Amino acid sequence: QRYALVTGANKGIGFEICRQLAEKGIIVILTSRNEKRGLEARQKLLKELNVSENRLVFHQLDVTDLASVAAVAVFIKSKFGKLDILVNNAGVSGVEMVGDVSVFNEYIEADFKALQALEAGAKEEPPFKPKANGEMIEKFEGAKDCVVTNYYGPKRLTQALIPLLQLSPSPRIVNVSSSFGSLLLLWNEWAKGVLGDEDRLTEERVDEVVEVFLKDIKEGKLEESQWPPHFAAERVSKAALNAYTKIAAKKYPSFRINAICPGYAKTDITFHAGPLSVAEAAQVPVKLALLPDGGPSGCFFPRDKALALY
Ligand SMILES: NC(=O)c1ccc[n+]([C@@H]2O[C@H](COP(=O)([O-])OP(=O)(O)OC[C@H]3O[C@@H](n4cnc5c(N)ncnc54)[C@H](OP(=O)(O)O)[C@@H]3O)[C@@H](O)[C@H]2O)c1
Ligand SMILES: CC1=C(C=O)C(C)(C)CCC1
């Protein structure tokens, strides 16, 4: 019997990760920061799955609350005694929209094009301003929430769950990341060098990168300090997550710990734009959660590479 914990599972990709893992016979701990949303999600998913009540368990979990993190570990130890799969899916964007919310999607599409060009050898991300009558506002509070949810959350939950995962015969961690964490998009040369220097990577060095970023946005210095012009907190947080994925895979060599991009999928975070359904997106993290023993660890996989792994 295998047990999987999925964070941010009341909606979006995380909800579908729960569906797909439960369909594979894994006992799923569906977690969410809001109790009512998570209980309702469990009820809906249990109905749709049409399976026995024991297949899907709810527990509260806010990945930014250290008490909540500790209590979920106590719960798993008492009820199940081990954990086999951790999916760090919860995430936020750090952006507030003013006006036409579809500007958010315009930025995503611009960024995908920029990434493709940079991966093909171009040396700069083109400036971009949107067409529609909206704007993405990126303030300190949202940036802090993004880093704490998207980077410290997976780090702290991983750390809290090591003892339980160590009791699995095939421990798996999947970090739902983004191709926008690419160092090519990070702008900050110091941070790119630190995160890119894999042999010297430590948790302390990654923490320093994200804390320097937060101080800069607090002080209104994002441009002058060479951070991204937009999606700054998202990019920093996913880059940091990718780096922590490598750190953790090295520290816990018997585990398989990987980061993925699920693809651009219609969820609340994207204002329900993007080519993929939530069910399609969840195929990616589920693929890495079910990776056979001996498979890659410490890697970042975009969607098509993840799905081709086996
Ligand atoms: N959709 C895409 O195109 C896309 C692409 C690449 C990567 N991703 C990643 O996919 C992940 C899932 O996002 P989504 O697209 O499914 O968006 P979503 O529909 O907004 O779902 C986000 C989930 O994260 C939960 N969450 C936020 N803060 C949390 C916290 N502190 N503690 C616990 N749960 C928290 C949210 O709960 P509430 O309901 O309480 O807010 C929600 O359940 C994210 O990490 C995102 O970065 C998405
Ligand atoms: C990393 C990133 C996100 C989460 O994956 C979006 C899709 C919410 C906006 C673009 C930057």
Residue numbers in the entry: 5 to 314
Paper passage:
Three salutaridine/menthone reductase like subfamilies of short‐chain dehydrogenases/reductases (SDRs)2 from Mentha piperita were identified, namely (−)‐menthone:(−)‐menthol reductase (MMR), (−)‐menthone:(+)‐neomenthol reductase (MNMR), and isopiperitenone reductase (IPR).1a,1b MMR and MNMR catalyze the ketoreduction of (−)‐menthone 1 a to (1R,2S,5R)‐menthol 2 a and (1S,2S,5R)‐neomenthol 2 b, respectively.1a Additionally, they act on isomenthone 1 b to produce (1R,2R,5R)‐neoisomenthol 2 c and (1R,2S,5S)‐isomenthol 2 d, respectively. Interestingly, the three Mentha SDRs have high protein‐sequence identities (63–68 %), so we performed comparative studies of MMR, MNMR, and IPR, to pinpoint the determinants of ketoreductase vs. ene‐reductase activity within SDRs. A key difference in the sequences between the ketoreductases and IPR was a substitution of the highly conserved catalytic Tyr residue for Glu (238 in IPR). We determined crystal structures of both MNMR and IPR, the latter in combination with NADP+, alkene 3 a, and β‐cyclocitral (non‐substrate).
No other major changes in residue positions were observed in the co‐crystal structures.
